[PDB]
DNA sequence: CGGCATACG
DNA sequence: CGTAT
DNA sequence: GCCG
């Protein structure tokens, strides 16, 4: 089992599903407090276990593998001997636990801003919808709309936006082409939003084409919420039988010669493009992001034309999107 | 021990 | 500060 | 929390 969770497929379903999930409520706990680090590790160790090519019945199986080590091993155990494990059952009963989560879940709120509210005493949507003066605009936004945000995005959904989407670019930009990406990319069958790269074949024709999409979108009344750029974060009206429903959608330009760099990124996960960009780094002196891959050594850029290029750039065996699932 | 991904709005 | 993979 |  190596190391880095790019240098192994991970799908979508997988043989340990209850112990990935019990290491994951750790990690985003961690993250409630601000231990990046400990967060990280218990990813990690979640993202082996959906590695592994069967279920882990016996904690002899977790000898050698990495990312476990006496606390996350001691889970799994508990898990393996009882079916539940004491700190993780814990955490998923606390007010803080899962008043951050209530909190951090709203499109607006990170964790610094939850954490405030909570030791400002507030435990419910309704304490902040009590407070509107607090609240930014992007925040009343993810309020209002929390309900439907929390309802899962279905396949059928991503299929009508993608149209919609579609018709947009080809007014504002002829030739200009729409990818989905993100989890669905990755053969997810529901979603919290939904994720587009856009592109066009000739290099610098996409300069100032969100500003058009989104122009164009709000003019058809699809556009809940926007924030007025390469990256638009919106809510969208999706339409649905005899009503609508509130739906987050991604928007993200890229020109063509960073195509396949931002389609990398934007596929995810989240945990697999952290690990590829350590994994450049750390292993092969590289550097990685959305736009490219620069060598700092000669000081020149990777000319990739797909992903395949990429993956063979940083010596690793091509993954398809459907093994990112880190 | 230091390090833990990297960007844009 | 928020957002994203 | 774990690795190198
Ligand atoms: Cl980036
Ligand atoms: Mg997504
Ligand atoms: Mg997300
Ligand atoms: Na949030
Ligand atoms: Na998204």
Avoid at 82 to 101: A, D, I, L, N, P
Avoid at 143 to 165: F, N, Y
Wanted: net charge neutral; with cysteine.
């Amino acid at each position: 089992m190596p190391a880095y969770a790019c240098q192994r497929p991970t799908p979508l379903t997988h043989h340990n599903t209850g112990l990935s999930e019990a290491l994951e409520i750790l990690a985003e706990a961690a993250g409630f407090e601000g231990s990046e680090g400990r967060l990280l590790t218990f990813c990690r160790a979640a993202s082996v276990l959906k590695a592994l090519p069967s279920p882990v019945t016996t904690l002899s199986q977790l000898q050698g593998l990495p990312h476990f080590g006496e606390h996350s091993s001691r889970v799994v155990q508990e898990l393996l001997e009882h079916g539940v494990c004491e700190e993780v059952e814990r955490v998923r009963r606390s007010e803080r636990y899962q008043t951050m989560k209530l909190f951090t879940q709203i499109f607006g709120v990170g964790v610094k801003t939850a954490d405030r509210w909570y030791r400002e005493g507030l435990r419910t949507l309704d304490d902040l919808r009590e407070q509107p003066q607090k609240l930014t605009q992007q925040q009343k936004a993810g309020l209002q709309h929390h309900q439907d945000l929390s309802t899962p995005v279905l396949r059928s959904d991503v299929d009508a936006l993608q149209q919609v989407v579609e018709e947009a670019v080809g007014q504002a930009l002829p030739g200009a082409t729409v990818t989905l990406t993100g989890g669905f990319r990755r053969g997810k069958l529901q979603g919290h939003d939904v994720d587009f790269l856009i592109t066009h074949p000739k290099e610098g024709q996409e300069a100032g084409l969100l500003p058009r999409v989104m122009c164009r979108l709000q003019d058809q009344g699809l556009i809940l919420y926007h924030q007025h750029f390469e990256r638009s974060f919106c809510i969208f009206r999706l339409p649905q039988p005899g009503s609508w429903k509130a739906v987050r959608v991604d928007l993200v330009v890229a020109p063509v010669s960073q195509f396949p760099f931002a389609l990398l990124s934007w596929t995810g996960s989240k945990l697999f493009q952290r690990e590829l960009r350590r994994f450049s780094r750390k292993e092969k002196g590289l550097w990685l992001n959305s736009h490219g891959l620069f060598d700092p050594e000669q000081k020149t850029f990777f000319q990739a034309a797909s992903e395949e290029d990429i993956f063979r750039h940083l010596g690793l065996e091509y993954l398809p999107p459907e093994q990112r699932n880190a």
